[model samples]
Target: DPTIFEERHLKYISQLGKGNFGSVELCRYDPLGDNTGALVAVKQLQHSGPDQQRDFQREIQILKALHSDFIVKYRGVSYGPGRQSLRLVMEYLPSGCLRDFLQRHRARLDASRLLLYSSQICKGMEYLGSRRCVHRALAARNILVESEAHVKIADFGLAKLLPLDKDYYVVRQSPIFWYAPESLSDNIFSRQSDVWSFGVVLYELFTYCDKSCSPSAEFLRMMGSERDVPALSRLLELLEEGQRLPAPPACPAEVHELMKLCWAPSPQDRPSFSALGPQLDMLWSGSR
Candidate 1:
């Protein structure tokens, strides 16, 4: 019974968050009985349908099979050999999501903080992309803030595995703005599709600074105009020849360039995740 979990297993802490599918509650369990401070998040499927079961199994299979410091752990799940409902176990974070943090304060996050968060997110996304896994939904809503300001990537429910051959026949889709232009326009959702969404997220992370204006694709306005080599404000770190943003922050020229690369209208022009590390490292301290 569900009571068994509460009576003999995990400590039933208060609920942390909720969504359309289920609720997220803080939980602690003695996996090794050593009084370990390992915190877990429980995703309870409300209806517990076939799709949920698939997700539950997929979550376990994916998280268990793959391990990376950048990606958040899936932990485990509880279900009978033939059970109707299942509980997905995941890492628990007290700080909640980046959206919450950004919304809580009226002012925008500082450049250092933004870079810190963005780089971490890029690391996570880089790991996932390298593994040929599409986050499917990479946005402020799913990205969680963990201890030490770690940007732990979350919400793998929408993830899709990309075959190396690029299977065009298999159909998949996601949200509009967060989805890649080619994905929506032609249903071709490759890793590059995730790149498009990542660019949108970059805008969101930056646009919070311009609280007075609505966040839109103003990068198009910046274009390849006569601004400068890194034609972006202080916000971008590696503003290359044609870097731009609707928002502004005092940042390096190369920063804007990197953003431009990510926001390229043509997927072929965009650089892979590995390309960012060197420049980021060089800009920071030449240390990964």
Candidate 2:
């Protein structure tokens, strides 16, 4: 049962961050009877135009339907003037997104923390699959870290909940680095494509964390340095010519194999998140 969180209940503090579409702010919520002052993130959309409003509603609709510990909890949406002026309330995660955490303190991120975060993300994707939902833009940047051991997926601007009969959705655009081959070619978006993006995030875990000079013997590491960085526009062309990105440097052989499986030429070859949850368990059962 969701209610319209009124303008009077929420008090905005400061801006958390801003993007071209909207600005997220830290907010204090004072409920009808309880004045305990709970913290929440309020995303305020700047453009009141119909296009922006529709996009905002799509995200809101997705968020409202989902309920999972591994997913960002949505409180409610607030209206200031009209439907165009919208504010989305979500659980306040203090540690920021996973990418920030990786960039800030890579050296301190132990294997245990890595295992935990990756496992948590796997569970989140599993939950999304249960709801017939597919997170189109799955990446490290779309994941929020609540603590070293806890994480939740965020950013549903491209997410879609499809009919039971449909296997995929059509999309006009996608991020090249994270996009799966089928997604890039056929304009098809599916949960399997998200698995491919998850593989990228898995590689990212090693790519950004361990910046050692050594490259894996079996594969070429995309070092993100000036020499190895591929231009995005040309990357698809290279892939068409049979170029494939290898697993991240220092990635365990087992995990690297999993990454390759996810990036297989055909989506049918990719494993589902349901199958991945158990694979992750076996992968980390020996680890701390």
Candidate 3:
């Protein structure tokens, strides 16, 4: 059974962010015996519709099953009176999301630091893959930073568990810009597809999380005045035509080459997360 806490024990501190799914807030959770409450991040969903309710339950179950140092730690859940409001409690990461951290520390970050983050992500993803779990959303924003040496993958709302007999899961929707070519064309997601998204994350890291350098921004810039077709169609076409996100300014050539390998047209050709760890480790030492 999952741990359940009384709503009374939760003290709202401040709002973190709000989106269509729900709002995540900074909170202090005081267990009855503890004098000082533990700081936590609470994802609050209020008056969720049937679809959102299903997705919420799915996310909760998936998170409960996952345990890894590079994955966000789930504490428990607290339900408001009448059970209309649901809050998912997780360990609070003080450094915030990796994207924001990259931007904030852009001046201080060096190549080795980026490689460390990349290696950690690979370690987490390698675990997920071993568990038959596919993190459909693996962008920088979905990763929380504890420190330069520690970052945990978060936001499993779009994650899926592949069946023992199946290698992929078909989904109706996904963030197209971060998707693999096969994912864009067929909406099929697999561990290999996740590898493609990791390439995009690598681009984000190398760019210091610059908003203008995001995958979407790069796509939109290339699609300028060719907007007659649907955005997704244009993107799919671009990707199909071998158009890939270019290396960020001053990006190490080796790392950029790895990014290109991750973006290989065939999912079967891309390196698995397990294979990426040693490459990143090598890059880290070489950069140093």
Candidate 4:
């Protein structure tokens, strides 16, 4: 078992950055008192509300059970100072999250590197599904990069674990931009719903955007005048009837097709990450 220790042994070095729910800090862990250990990220919850605390505990519970290379490693959960916020100890990767990395290197990155990153995400999703966990907010912002090509899924603030043999869970709320269409309306969650968010992440990756540009953005780019309000209304009507967003710029036609497959209306039609990993490999091989 991973040893749990008090926060007194940890020295907070510097602030890394803020996440959606917490702040991650660079910390030095030295329980043995001789500074004999490595640097770690200490993620502290910003709020201690009942719901937030419950979610925090759930994240800890799920992460403690995971030891996959594709997923971030969890060290221990600790608290410091009197009545302080809870802190989660995690492996410190020098490179920041994938979203920032993609933004920083967008001009120099190519489709091949994008495919490699997608494959790593697929492996991570496959591992999470095998463990009966659903990363409800799967996105580039939720992933960490250790090297140019090494990516690991992180941030379990919105994750849910299922009982053995169960495949889906229901929730009252979800990330508006990343939730699947069904999840957006009916609050149902499944690994397939995660597949939908994965498609959005692909859009983010292919377009080199912080978030996938919605059809609204496309409409505005085409016609944003007050006179175009009626056209926007019609577009919303078409979306209600299952209109889809246009493909990302510069994405291969086949890859765009895969993204469309992931966003299919019927969750059952979406491919599993296990299947996606090989499909990505095949696409990469075809390019070569």
Best by lDDT: 3
Which candidate leads in TM-score?
A: 3
RMSD of each: 8.0, 4.1, 2.2, 3.5
Instruction: State the lDDT at 196 in candidate 1.
Output: 65
lDDT (10s digit) by residue, model 1, range 152-240: 78877767677878732235324454655566655676677777677667666655434443233344343335445432332132232
Between prediction 3 and prediction 4, the one with superior TM-score is 3
Model 3 steric clash total: 0
Candidate 3 C-alpha lDDT tens digits along 30-73? 76636487888888776578878788877888887888999999
Model 4 TM-score is 0.85
What root-mean-square deviation over C-alphas does model 2 reach?
4.1
How many steric overlaps are in each model, in order?
A: 17, 0, 0, 0
lDDT of 4 by residue, 143-255 (tens): 99989978999888788987677678877634455667667667789999999889878887888763446544655554535554665355444445776667887688888
TM-score of every prediction relative to native: 0.73, 0.85, 0.92, 0.85
Residue 133's lDDT within candidate 1 is 82
Superposed by TM-score, candidate 2 places the C-alpha of residue 3 at a distance from the truth, in angstroms, of: 4.0
Q: If ranked by lDDT, best first, what sequence of candidates would result?
A: 3, 4, 2, 1
Stretches of candidate 1 off by over 4 Å are 1-8, 11-19, 30-38, 80-83, 105-109, 167-174, 209-245, 250-253, 286-288
lDDT per model, in order? 0.63, 0.76, 0.86, 0.80
Clashes of 2: 0
Candidate 4, residue 241: how far the Cα is off, in Å: 2.5
Per-residue lDDT of model 2, residues 202-276, tens digit only: 877766533342222112344233545545545656555665556555577878888788777788989988887
